[PDB]
Design a protein around this ligand. Structure first.
Ligand SMILES: O=P(O)(O)O[C@@H]1[C@H](O)[C@H](O)[C@@H](OP(=O)(O)O)[C@H](OP(=O)(O)O)[C@H]1O
Lengths: 10, 152
């Protein structure tokens, strides 16, 4: 399980 | 034990990228962009629905998903038509199904529109999850060096 470092919450 | 060097990964994810055979478990609306528990609860729910439909003789849709600089794309296997496309910037979290070595899911969408997409891979899910990890890290690294465009 991991977060996407290039995700844009905007 | 695949080679995960930068040059190799770039060739791996460019264009159509990497294609995997699988089945769509389902898509669930979730309240946050991330969370181990959030995803496991969603996976359990979607599978619960699948089990209920299977008892009625239904089957999960056969698909093939690709991992590329374009993010994750889901194609219908029988027709080859693109049905879902989630760009790299819309994917916020990847989660393996701790109860199934052949299933994983991901959360996509912007704030207020998060959805958990659940996938049942034909083979083990690990290589797919690892491709996503490598893809994201590579894009982050290329963007930091400002070379994404020169590689995609
Ligand atoms: O043997 P049974 O009881 O008929 O049940 C099938 C079995 O669990 C398969 O492994 C599963 O495929 P996956 O492992 O790829 O999910 C299939 O799903 P499907 O019906 O959605 O193809 C089920 O129907």
């Amino acid at each position: 399980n991991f977060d996407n470092p290039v995700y844009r919450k905007t | 034990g695949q080679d995960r060097s930068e040059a190799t990964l770039i060739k791996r994810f460019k264009g159509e990228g990497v294609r995997y055979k699988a089945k769509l478990i389902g898509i669930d609306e979730v309240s946050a962009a991330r969370g181990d528990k959030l995803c496991q609860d969603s996976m359990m729910k979607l599978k619960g629905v699948v089990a209920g439909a299977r008892s009625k003789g239904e089957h999960k849709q056969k698909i093939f998903l690709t991992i590329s600089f374009g993010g994750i794309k889901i194609f219908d296997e029988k027709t080859g038509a693109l049905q879902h496309h989630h760009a790299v910037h819309e994917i916020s979290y990847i989660a393996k199904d701790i109860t199934d070595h052949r299933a994983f899911g991901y959360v996509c969408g912007k704030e207020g529109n998060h959805r958990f997409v659940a996938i049942k891979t034909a083979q083990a899910a690990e290589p797919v999850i690892l491709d996503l990890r490598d893809l994201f890290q590579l894009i982050y690294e290329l963007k930091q060096r400002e070379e994404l465009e020169k590689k995609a």
